Amino acid sequence: GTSKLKYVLQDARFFLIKSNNHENVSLAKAKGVWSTLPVNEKKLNLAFRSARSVILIFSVRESGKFQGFARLSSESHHIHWVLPAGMSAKMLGGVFKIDWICRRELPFTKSAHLTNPWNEHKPVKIGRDGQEIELECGTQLCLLFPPDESIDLYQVIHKM
């Protein structure tokens, strides 16, 4: 049901994560980890100390979809990521642990009614990697995803 999910999302912060390939999101779902660029790694570390839950909502560039969402379980710490033209293995060296909340997709067509105040009220799908999503927009976006019956939020709740 949605009750435990709403509990996890209560007073959470939300960040849009953009990945240039599906390979890295699949790796993150398999291994429960994410790495980002230092500007964003600093923001997420700050946010992790500031809020009961920090939620990353993932979208693979050009997929037209979100691929799921997850809660930070740690700050970064120093995996075989697939690097784009220009990115370095040292820039992605900081590794966050994450607990997936939903590994199911949501097409952007289903989130067209949600605008993000922190990105000039553009549709929530629009945003650079690391863009923060305002509370109400982010909560509604998470609730649009199909429920993921493989996930038991009980152990997620037993970390907050």
Is 81 part of any known ligand binding site?
Answer: yes
Burial of 109 (0-12, 13-18, 19+ CB in 10 A): exposed
Alpha helices in 68-134 (DSSP H): none
Chain breaks after residues in the chain, where C lies over 2.5 Å from next N = 78
What whole-number distance in Å separates Cα of residue 55 and Cα of residue 113?
A: 20
Is 63 part of any known ligand binding site?
Answer: no
Which residue in the block uniquely carries the two structure tokens 């799921």?
68
| CA 146 vs CA 19, 58, 85, 114: distances in Å | 21, 15, 34, 16
- Which amino acid would we find at residue 104? R
In the structure encoding, which two tokens stand for residue 36, read together?
């980002």
What whole-number distance in Å separates Cα of residue 89 and Cα of residue 83?
A: 7
Is 129 part of any known ligand binding site?
Answer: yes
Q: Which residues of 125-156 are buried (b: 16+ CB within 10 A; e: fewer)?
A: bebebbbbbbbebbbebbeebeeeeebebeeb
Half-sphere exposure of 90 (CA within 13 A, CB side): 0
Is 34 part of any known ligand binding site?
Answer: yes
Yes or no: say if 60 and 112 are a contact pair by the CB < 8 Å rule.
no
What whole-number distance in Å separates Cα of residue 11 and Cα of residue 81?
A: 31
Q: Which CATH superfamily is domain 1-160 in?
A: ph1033 like domains (3.10.590.10)
Is 3 part of any known ligand binding site?
Answer: no
What are the residues whose beta carbons fall under 8 Å from the beta carbon of 13, sequence distance 6 or more? Answer: 47, 50, 51, 53, 54, 55, 132, 135, 138
Header resolution in angstroms: 1.5
Domain boundaries of the chain, sorted by first residue:
1-160
In the structure encoding, which two tokens stand for residue 132, read together?
């923060």
**What was the experiment behind these coordinates?**
X-ray
What whole-number distance in Å separates Cα of residue 142 and Cα of residue 57?
A: 8
